[PDB]
């Protein structure tokens, strides 16, 4: 549960950070990019993206 999980992870986080803001619409190449250098997959990091966005997003209430 989770899951949990975290998850998340890593280091592509760590990665993500940076990148996600500068620009957050990561196109196809742009991700399959980032992949080959190391790793991160177009799966986590859509996941990832799309989920560190969210936590943007609100809130809010935001809530």
């Not at 957050?24 to 196109?27: G, I, L, S």
């Given at each position: 549960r989770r899951k949990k999980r975290t998850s998340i992870e890593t280091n592509v986080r760590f990665a993500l950070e940076k990148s996600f803001l500068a620009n957050?619409?990561?196109?196809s190449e742009e991700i399959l990019l980032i992949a080959e250098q190391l790793h991160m997959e177009k799966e986590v990091i859509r996941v990832w993206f799309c989920n560190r966005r969210q936590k943007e997003k609100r809130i809010n209430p935001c809530s």
């Open positions: 957050q619409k990561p196109t």
